Amino acid sequence: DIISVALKRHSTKAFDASKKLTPEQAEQIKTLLQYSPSSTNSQPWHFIVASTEEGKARVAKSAAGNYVFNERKMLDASHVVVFCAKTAMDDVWLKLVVDQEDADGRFATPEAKAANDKGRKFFADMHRKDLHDDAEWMAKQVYLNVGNFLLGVAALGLDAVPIEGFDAAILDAEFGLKEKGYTSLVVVPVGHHSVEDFNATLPKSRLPQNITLTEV
Amino acid sequence: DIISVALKRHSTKAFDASKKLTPEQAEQIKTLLQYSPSSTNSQPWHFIVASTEEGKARVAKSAAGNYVFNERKMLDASHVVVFCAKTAMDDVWLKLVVDQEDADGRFATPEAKAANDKGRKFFADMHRKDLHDDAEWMAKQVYLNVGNFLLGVAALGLDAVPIEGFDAAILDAEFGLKEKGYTSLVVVPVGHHSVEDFNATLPKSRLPQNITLTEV
Ligand SMILES: Cc1cc2nc3c(=O)[nH]c(=O)nc-3n(C[C@@H](O)[C@@H](O)[C@@H](O)COP(=O)(O)O)c2cc1C
Ligand SMILES: Cc1cc2nc3c(=O)[nH]c(=O)nc-3n(C[C@H](O)[C@H](O)[C@H](O)COP(=O)(O)O)c2cc1C
Ligand SMILES: O=C(O)c1cccnc1
Ligand SMILES: O=C(O)c1cccnc1
B206 annotated among ligand-binding-site residues: yes
User: Is the torsion defined by CA of A108, B76, B18, A35 positive or negative?
Assistant: positive
For B114-134, b/e burial (b = at least 16 CB within 10 A) is eebbeebbebbeebbeeeeeb
Q: With beta carbons less than 8 A apart as the criterion, state whether A201 and A14 touch.
A: no
| Rounded CA separation B189/A144 (Å) | 17
Contact (CB<8Å) A209/B162: no
Say if residues A162 and A188 touch (Cβ distance below 8 Å): yes
Contacts of B196 (CB under 8 A, 6+ apart): B13, B14
CA torsion angle for B117, B118, B124, B127 (degrees, to 10)? -170
**Assigned CATH topology for domain A1-216:** NADH Oxidase (3.40.109)
User: Cβ contacts (< 8 Å) between B185 and chain A: which residues?
Assistant: 140
Residue B31 among known ligand-binding residues = no
When scoring B98, B171, B205 by the number of chain A Cβ atoms within 10 A, the one with the most, hence best to mutate, is: B205
Break chain B into its structural domains and give their ranges: 1-216
Q: What is the resolution of this structure in A?
A: 2.4
Picking from B179, B182, B197, the residue whose alpha carbon sits closest to that of residue B69 is B197
The closest alpha carbon to B155, from A137, A38, A1, belongs to A1
Q: Which residues of A participate in catalysis according to the annotation?
A: 13, 73, 164
- For B70, half-sphere exposure in the C-beta direction (CA atoms, 13 angstrom radius) is 24
Closest CA to A102 of A171, A189, A41, A28: A41
In whole angstroms, give the CA distance from residue A178 to residue A53.
24
**Is A61 annotated in some ligand binding site?**
no
Q: Which positions in chain A touch B132 (Cβ < 8 Å)? A: none
Question: Is A18 exposed, middle or buried, given 0-12, 13-18 or 19+ CB atoms closer than 10 A?
Answer: exposed
Residues with CB under 6 A from ligand 3: A 39-40, 123; B 164-165
In the PDB record, what is the listed experimental method? X-ray
Q: Hey, is B175 helix, strand or coil?
A: coil
- Which chain A residues touch B50 with a CB distance below 8 Å? 215-216
Spatial separation of the C-alpha atoms in residues A61 and A73, rounded to whole Å: 12
Which of A177, A156, A140, A181 has its CA nearest to residue A32?
A156
Q: How many CA atoms lie within 13 A of B76 on its CB side?
A: 19
Asked if residues B19 and B192 have their Cβ atoms less than 8 Å apart, the reply is yes
Closest CA to B154 of B29, B16, B24, B22: B29
